[PDB]
Amino acid sequence: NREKIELKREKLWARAHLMPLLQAEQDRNVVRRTFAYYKREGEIMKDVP
Amino acid sequence: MDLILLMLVAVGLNIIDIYIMIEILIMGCTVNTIYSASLDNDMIGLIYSLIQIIIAGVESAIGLSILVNYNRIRNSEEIE
Amino acid sequence: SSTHTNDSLNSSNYVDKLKDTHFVFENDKLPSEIPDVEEVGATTAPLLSAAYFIGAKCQDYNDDFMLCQKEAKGNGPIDCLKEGRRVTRCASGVLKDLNTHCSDEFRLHWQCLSFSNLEYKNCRKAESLLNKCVFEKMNLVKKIPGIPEDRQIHLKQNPVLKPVALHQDSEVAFKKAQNENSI
Amino acid sequence: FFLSEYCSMVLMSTLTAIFFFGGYLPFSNTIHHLILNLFDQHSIYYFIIEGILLSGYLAIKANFFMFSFVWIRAAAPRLRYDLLILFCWYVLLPIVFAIVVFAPGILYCFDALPVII
Amino acid sequence: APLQQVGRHGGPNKCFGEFQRVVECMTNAKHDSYEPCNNLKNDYLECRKHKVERYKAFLMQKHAEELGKDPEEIGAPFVRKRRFLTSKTLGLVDGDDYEIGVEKI
Amino acid sequence: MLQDLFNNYVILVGILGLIFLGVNYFIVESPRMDENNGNISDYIEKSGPFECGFSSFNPIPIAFILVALLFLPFDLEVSSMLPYIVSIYSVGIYGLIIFILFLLILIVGFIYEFNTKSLSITTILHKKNKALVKNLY
Amino acid sequence: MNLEILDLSILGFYSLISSNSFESIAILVATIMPVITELWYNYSQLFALLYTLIYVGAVVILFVFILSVINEKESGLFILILVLLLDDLDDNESNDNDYNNVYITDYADWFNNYNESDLSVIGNLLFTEYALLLLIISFILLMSIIGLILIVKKD
Amino acid sequence: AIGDYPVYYKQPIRWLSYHAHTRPHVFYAIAVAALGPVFMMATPLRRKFLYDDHEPLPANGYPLPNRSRDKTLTGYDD
Amino acid sequence: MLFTSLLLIIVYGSLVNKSHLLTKLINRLGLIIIIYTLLIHLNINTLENLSIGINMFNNLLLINSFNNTIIELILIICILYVLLISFNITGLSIIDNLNYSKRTFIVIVLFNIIGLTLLPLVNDIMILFIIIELQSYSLYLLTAIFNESHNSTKSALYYFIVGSIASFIILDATVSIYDDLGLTNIQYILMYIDKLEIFDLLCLLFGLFIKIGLAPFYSYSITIYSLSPTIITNYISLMPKLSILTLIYIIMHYINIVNNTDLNYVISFLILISMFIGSFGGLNVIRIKTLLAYSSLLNVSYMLLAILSNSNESIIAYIYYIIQYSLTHINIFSIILVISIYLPIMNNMLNVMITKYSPIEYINQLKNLFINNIFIAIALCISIFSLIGIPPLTGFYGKYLVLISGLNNGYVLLSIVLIIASSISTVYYATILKVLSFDTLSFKDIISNNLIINTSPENNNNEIKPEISNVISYVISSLTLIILLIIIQYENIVKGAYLVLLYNWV
Amino acid sequence: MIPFEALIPYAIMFAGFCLGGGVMNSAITADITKRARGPNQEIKRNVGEDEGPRNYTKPRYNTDQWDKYFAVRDLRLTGSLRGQSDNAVAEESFKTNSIQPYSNTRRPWVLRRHIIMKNSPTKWARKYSSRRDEREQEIKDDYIRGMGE
Amino acid sequence: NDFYDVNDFFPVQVDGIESSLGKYEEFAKDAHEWESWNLQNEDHPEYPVKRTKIRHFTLNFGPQHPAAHGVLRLILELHGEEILRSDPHVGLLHRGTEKLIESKTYMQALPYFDRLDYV
Numbered sequence A: 001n002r003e004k005i006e007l008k009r010e011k012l013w014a015r016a017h018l019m020p021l022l023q024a025e026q027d028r029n030v031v032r033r034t035f036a037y038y039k040r041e042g043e044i045m046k047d048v049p
Numbered sequence B: 001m002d003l004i005l006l007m008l009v010a011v012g013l014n015i016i017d018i019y020i021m022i023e024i025l026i027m028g029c030t031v032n033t034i035y036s037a038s039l040d041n042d043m044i045g046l047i048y049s050l051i052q053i054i055i056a057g058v059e060s061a062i063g064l065s066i067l068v069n070y071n072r073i074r075n076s077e078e079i080e
Numbered sequence C: 001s002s003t004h005t006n007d008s009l010n011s012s013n014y015v016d017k018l019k020d021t022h023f024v025f026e027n028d029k030l031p032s033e034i035p036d037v038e039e040v041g042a043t044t045a046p047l048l049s050a051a052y053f054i055g056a057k058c059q060d061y062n063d064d065f066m067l068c069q070k071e072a073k074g075n076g077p078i079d080c081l082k083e084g085r086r087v088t089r090c091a092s093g094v095l096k097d098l099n100t101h102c103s104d105e106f107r108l109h110w111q112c113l114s115f116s117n118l119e120y121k122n123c124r125k126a127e128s129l130l131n132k133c134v135f136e137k138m139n140l141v142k143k144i145p146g147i148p149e150d151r152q153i154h155l156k157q158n159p160v161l162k163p164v165a166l167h168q169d170s171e172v173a174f175k176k177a178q179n180e181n182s183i
Numbered sequence D: 001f002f003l004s005e006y007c008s009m010v011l012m013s014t015l016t017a018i019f020f021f022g023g024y025l026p027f028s029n030t031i032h033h034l035i036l037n038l039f040d041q042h043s044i045y046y047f048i049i050e051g052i053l054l055s056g057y058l059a060i061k062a063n064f065f066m067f068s069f070v071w072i073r074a075a076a077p078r079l080r081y082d083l084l085i086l087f088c089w090y091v092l093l094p095i096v097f098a099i100v101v102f103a104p105g106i107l108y109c110f111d112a113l114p115v116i117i
Numbered sequence E: 001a002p003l004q005q006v007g008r009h010g011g012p013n014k015c016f017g018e019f020q021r022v023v024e025c026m027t028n029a030k031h032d033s034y035e036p037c038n039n040l041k042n043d044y045l046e047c048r049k050h051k052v053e054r055y056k057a058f059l060m061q062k063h064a065e066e067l068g069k070d071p072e073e074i075g076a077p078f079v080r081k082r083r084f085l086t087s088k089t090l091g092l093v094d095g096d097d098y099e100i101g102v103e104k105i
Numbered sequence F: 001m002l003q004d005l006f007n008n009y010v011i012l013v014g015i016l017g018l019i020f021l022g023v024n025y026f027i028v029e030s031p032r033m034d035e036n037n038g039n040i041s042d043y044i045e046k047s048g049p050f051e052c053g054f055s056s057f058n059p060i061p062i063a064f065i066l067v068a069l070l071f072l073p074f075d076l077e078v079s080s081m082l083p084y085i086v087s088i089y090s091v092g093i094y095g096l097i098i099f100i101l102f103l104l105i106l107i108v109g110f111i112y113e114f115n116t117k118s119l120s121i122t123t124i125l126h127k128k129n130k131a132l133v134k135n136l137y
Numbered sequence G: 001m002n003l004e005i006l007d008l009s010i011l012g013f014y015s016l017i018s019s020n021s022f023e024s025i026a027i028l029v030a031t032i033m034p035v036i037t038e039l040w041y042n043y044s045q046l047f048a049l050l051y052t053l054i055y056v057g058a059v060v061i062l063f064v065f066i067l068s069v070i071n072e073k074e075s076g077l078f079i080l081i082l083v084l085l086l087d088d089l090d091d092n093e094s095n096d097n098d099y100n101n102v103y104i105t106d107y108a109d110w111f112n113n114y115n116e117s118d119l120s121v122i123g124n125l126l127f128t129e130y131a132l133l134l135l136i137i138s139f140i141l142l143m144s145i146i147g148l149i150l151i152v153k154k155d
Numbered sequence H: 001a002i003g004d005y006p007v008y009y010k011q012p013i014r015w016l017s018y019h020a021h022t023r024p025h026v027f028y029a030i031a032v033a034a035l036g037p038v039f040m041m042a043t044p045l046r047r048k049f050l051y052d053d054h055e056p057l058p059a060n061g062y063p064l065p066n067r068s069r070d071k072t073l074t075g076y077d078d
Numbered sequence I: 001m002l003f004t005s006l007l008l009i010i011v012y013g014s015l016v017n018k019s020h021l022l023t024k025l026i027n028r029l030g031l032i033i034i035i036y037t038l039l040i041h042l043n044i045n046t047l048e049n050l051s052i053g054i055n056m057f058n059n060l061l062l063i064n065s066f067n068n069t070i071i072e073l074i075l076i077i078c079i080l081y082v083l084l085i086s087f088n089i090t091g092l093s094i095i096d097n098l099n100y101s102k103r104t105f106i107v108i109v110l111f112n113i114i115g116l117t118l119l120p121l122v123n124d125i126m127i128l129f130i131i132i133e134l135q136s137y138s139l140y141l142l143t144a145i146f147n148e149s150h151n152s153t154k155s156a157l158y159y160f161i162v163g164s165i166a167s168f169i170i171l172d173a174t175v176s177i178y179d180d181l182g183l184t185n186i187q188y189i190l191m192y193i194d195k196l197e198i199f200d201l202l203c204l205l206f207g208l209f210i211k212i213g214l215a216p217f218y219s220y221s222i223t224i225y226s227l228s229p230t231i232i233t234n235y236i237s238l239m240p241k242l243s244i245l246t247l248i249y250i251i252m253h254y255i256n257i258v259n260n261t262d263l264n265y266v267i268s269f270l271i272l273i274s275m276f277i278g279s280f281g282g283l284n285v286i287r288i289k290t291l292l293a294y295s296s297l298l299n300v301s302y303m304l305l306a307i308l309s310n311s312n313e314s315i316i317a318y319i320y321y322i323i324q325y326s327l328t329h330i331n332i333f334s335i336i337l338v339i340s341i342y343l344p345i346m347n348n349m350l351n352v353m354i355t356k357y358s359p360i361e362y363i364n365q366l367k368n369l370f371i372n373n374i375f376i377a378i379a380l381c382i383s384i385f386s387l388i389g390i391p392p393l394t395g396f397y398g399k400y401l402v403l404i405s406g407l408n409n410g411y412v413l414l415s416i417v418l419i420i421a422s423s424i425s426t427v428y429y430a431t432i433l434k435v436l437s438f439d440t441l442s443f444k445d446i447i448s449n450n451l452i453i454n455t456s457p458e459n460n461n462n463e464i465k466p467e468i469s470n471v472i473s474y475v476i477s478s479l480t481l482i483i484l485l486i487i488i489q490y491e492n493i494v495k496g497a498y499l500v501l502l503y504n505w506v
Numbered sequence J: 001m002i003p004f005e006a007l008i009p010y011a012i013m014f015a016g017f018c019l020g021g022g023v024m025n026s027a028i029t030a031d032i033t034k035r036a037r038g039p040n041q042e043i044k045r046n047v048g049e050d051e052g053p054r055n056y057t058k059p060r061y062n063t064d065q066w067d068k069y070f071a072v073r074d075l076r077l078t079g080s081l082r083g084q085s086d087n088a089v090a091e092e093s094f095k096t097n098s099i100q101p102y103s104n105t106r107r108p109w110v111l112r113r114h115i116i117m118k119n120s121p122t123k124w125a126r127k128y129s130s131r132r133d134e135r136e137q138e139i140k141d142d143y144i145r146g147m148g149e
Numbered sequence K: 001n002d003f004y005d006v007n008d009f010f011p012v013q014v015d016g017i018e019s020s021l022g023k024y025e026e027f028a029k030d031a032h033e034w035e036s037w038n039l040q041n042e043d044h045p046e047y048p049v050k051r052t053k054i055r056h057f058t059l060n061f062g063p064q065h066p067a068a069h070g071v072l073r074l075i076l077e078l079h080g081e082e083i084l085r086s087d088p089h090v091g092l093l094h095r096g097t098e099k100l101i102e103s104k105t106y107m108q109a110l111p112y113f114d115r116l117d118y119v
């Protein structure tokens, strides 16, 4: 159980190093889908002044 | 439809059938809480649901104990 | 944790039927005002194998990328788009290096992870070779912050928890290095 | 109904193997290692042998308890029901609650509280 | 003060930030009334149910109906069966349309 | 974690239930084939109870009732130990002390029902003995 | 074909016609099973299993336990189907049409590197944050043990 | 008193012996259960004589450096 | 102090041998525990400091000067009730030994006081449901503590079912509130007091209205009170209203922030209907406990008008009324537990079956109490005269203060009906006084030796033999003079209620 | 004197466990590996001549929420939930195939169709009273009433 | 009798039942509907309850039982589980050996005895 604690710590730091990389692509996807939503809404409601 | 109180037709004619309707009624409350908690990703709602399930169990045990002693009270000659 | 969510793939297609889930695509790419970046193409196992070398090489940018998220005060995705590309480029730099310096040492390790449930405890023999190679050719080291150097888990000579089944390519490659290197 | 009683016997014998005798883990790691070194991990023949071995270890452990289901039946007279309900409440339950307050104490004393790695 | 809106991993969930900004405004000392915090209250309710945003989706559905805009060309492509998230659909270079494996990971 | 393999198993077991019932209904020989004396319905002699041969026609002990009734409070005690199992590390000493307190209060109930001997069946109706006492005059 | 509707229609049919207490206890089991199964899929697998462990395993078999103790003694097809059909027509529990016709998603994020089950968080809060709620519950359980014995025990 | 039931506040030692002979199902369940909290109390003894407690886990999200953003950070630019 | 001593009483009672003297002595241990609780409570809790309101136990429990008033009152009334079970109410072994036949009686009562005292303090919907069950479960057990009795068990079964439906309504309102807001703490809900369906708090009130016996739900309370033993009815018909009415007042305090009129009309519909049934109902009744059940409903109707109005004068009206009504209720039931010694004994027609659970059951069993004991008859007369509202007793100031709060908030219709309903109810309070005294002069010189009190043994024939025990007599006299002579210190008491605050401040 | 006739059933029960385990270990491993070879069926079946030894992938257990995000991320890269790839640069199709699932948030069927579970003081007001819905509809209306400013 | 069957407190004399609007006999013809006007308490020990004489649970531990190592019909009358009365019905193996011995000489009567106790 003391070995699992260190095996747990090794894995959490491994995940912490990958977090900025995997979140940088997740922030881009959220931005990309957010711009596509507002592009579609402007397209549909362009005739409304 | 239920505004004419249809659920009264769906409850049997024994005291034990009332006890079950109370459980099925409360079961709806817990299912409503689990529904909201999961959508909100809120564990506080899941703490509430866990309490409701545990409290709804204690209510059943007391009610059955009263019903059990109610039953033996009639069958209490025991003069054999 | 296998909890159902509204944000990714669920356990079974019966969850999808109840939720009436639509898996929606968005063809629209990013606008040209945001300069493009080359996304990392590595899968799960290679990233977990090179995670501590991305941490050693991109430490400044990862900290700065996160510090932008802390100080953006809720507008993190939009106000850290430029700082989020340095991290993507830095991490692509490391995976490109491992492919051009330690291709076989790297592949051996993450084939072990794909063979042993993606657990670091099961792949120490392959991992030790990869760390030794990376140090001499890129100077990167694996360090677990918060503990003394003498008490890091991956340097434990006699671990309590060991793999049940051996990786043949790891055991064969290990003993070869016991001749090539342990002169 | 008869099949159900024997599915439970097989199951509860397997569960005792899982909880106390390591499940599918080998009796000897060396014998497990030596046997598997005779097969190449790049061919599907390796994985059949490992699956046969790993289920074999469980089967031998499980068989010992399916044996003990029968063995105790041939050696112990049937226990009276009134003395049977009082056994689990007045003897087993206090012990089982005594341990459930004992194991967390020993683990905490030596800073060995478990975590899912 | 007690924690409300705790995520399934022990941290703040999606809508905790909005609720916290409400508490800061209501318990603030520089406010004479609760008027300035009225917008923050709407955002917390909005974050949870999206009622105003779902309403906006209803008009954009209804406005396209009265103009004749084709749903397939204004909407976004979607797939209902997870087994048919094929590499042809995902856009991979030499991807087949054969179904993908969603049996066991 | 995918569970489409699990779903097929549950579906197959559901199909296996219909097969067990009907395989008897399609393999047994026709009642005419064996003896023709009747179906299970009309043959009320065959469709009846077993009373070892002789035809005949629940005031259970209160101790049995208290065994079942007290099962429910002691079950909710056990099921509410579940959250502590998967969080024993992250609650630390604080959650461990609370857990022990959560168990002490329930144990005071165990003491109470151990002293009253509530589960004992007892024998109040019978097993009486007396002293023969002469009453000389 | 959301077959969960057909399970309750059968259930709603037998609730209107049940006579003895055998069928009344059957309505209980026939209601938890749709509740458990509709929780296993969709919303919460953890509380589907907690319900089976706590309701079926603990409070349901107590009903049949006392039914054998209590006793076992002792309409028209047009009206039932008419009532069930009338009950079937209007099944919208809420009248926010957009909330019931418009779908939503969530965005995942990688900020949570310490991923653990819900039962880990619930224990984390129940044994720390709301330790009063946990302690009162053991107090309510304690009163029941005393409460059961005083009600039922004869002498 | 060859067989009398002991009084706890006058004969503490014999009172436990009566219960360790006639009620083994109570005496040793209490004895086992008390060995848990007893072992918890001896935790400070282990700290000073055997080994310190481990370092706590990094289970609070990404470790954010406690400083201001770097200003000269370059490289990997568009 | 309450909880810790309860465990000691639970364990100790299960050890010692079943006997009446030990059961009565353990009942005197609880009387100490309740007394000790009051001394510790009053020591730390002060009106001057609890004025702001203080959060406790992670904001689950919130305590202020309004709640703190009732906790001390609840503890006081629980002392006067335990005096009955802990000492002799008559001294005749046949009648009294019922109070000592149960060892868990005092334990269940101590369970309820923990339930009663925590209910006004709740500040979370999660703990609201838990605490309301702790109080609700304790009442069902106390109703069925005499498990041999057929009527008692039949009442607990009726009580459990109605309360279970009542608790489900309470649980469902909280779930609906959580569905809209996702918050459990009551203070956090107050931030969205304008953004939530205010009628879901009314659905919460409909559950609490069942538990206090308010019409149209009044039917079960009248049945329950007229079947339980008089010692049991003395507790279950007063205590739940002490802690629930305090909770209802607080919930209405938060509700009137948005001042929704539709909410007030429905509650006025229930208050108006209850006064009608509470007044016209008791006109045709023979059982005294059924009479005091209709009397209880009418007073709860008055106390809701003070709750519904909910102003600065409503705190004074409620705080004063809830105190005087408790003492009046204790005084009346204590007398009914005593005057059973004057019942005649047969040596016939109408075959009236009396049991040891309700020896005094009919109003005409109070006949000629002016003859058998004049001093205690006036005490019952003064108590009934307070319920009528004859000044300058305590009862007048309750109605006078309630009327001020009611009319100051425009409840003209309800104020007039309560004054009509009060006069209609005076008919059946006057019947109790008619039975007490009106046939005095015909029965003045009668040869009475068949009373129950005449089966008491003669001790010495030289020493004086008092007819009534010491403690019960001192309680009856004290509460009769407090009811009668409130005019002396009324000004100080009312000025002592101006200070009880519920977030008034400034 | 060991009876072999007595141990015959055990050797058959031992084969029962081995039969089930041997199939599961090999079939699931082979399927996972094959689908992790490429994005089409003409790649999965055939083995190239210039391809090296095959590295099987064992089935994965004890996962968490990151493995559900990693699985979809691997799907968008290789066409498999457990694909293998270590290219430092992803395909240009990676930036236009993110799968975001949209699902409804309606109450369970049992909560709104059961003959008994649907009856409640507040569930009728949600179903038959317009008080709540008219109040909320004001906020939706005032969204489009404020676009003029 | 055969089919059905029917104090610890002072016999209390209650006379003159009256309510606020009148006396009992003035409303006694309507009091059958008012259940709070029932003068008959259901807890009085003299309350007449015509309860049927349900026989005790009588199990037939009949011959077809492994315990009955012959032909036994054991009739058990029990309260709950504790046995009140038991009525063994022997004779299911009565073959009249005593009647048959009288018609046979002493040498022929001997085999009749090996068949009394089989073991």
Ligand SMILES: CCCCCCCCCCCCCCCCCC(=O)OC[C@H](COP(=O)(O)OCCN)OC(=O)CCCCCCCCCCCCCCCCC
Pocket (backbone or CB within 6 Å): F017, G007, G008, G010, G011, G014, G018, G022, G023, G025, G026, G027, G029, G030, G031, G033, G034
């Ligand atoms: C794997 C399948 C297991 C179930 C097999 C039985 C299926 C038959 C349909 C019953 C179950 C439907 C669920 C609704 C309960 C209805 C119970 C009822 O009303 O009685 C059914 C049964 C037969 O009697 P019946 O002729 O239908 O009615 C008039 C009899 N006087 O009256 C009886 O009590 C006879 C014995 C039946 C005991 C069944 C116990 C209750 C069911 C629990 C198991 C299934 C759980 C529910 C799953 C489906 C939920 C929709």
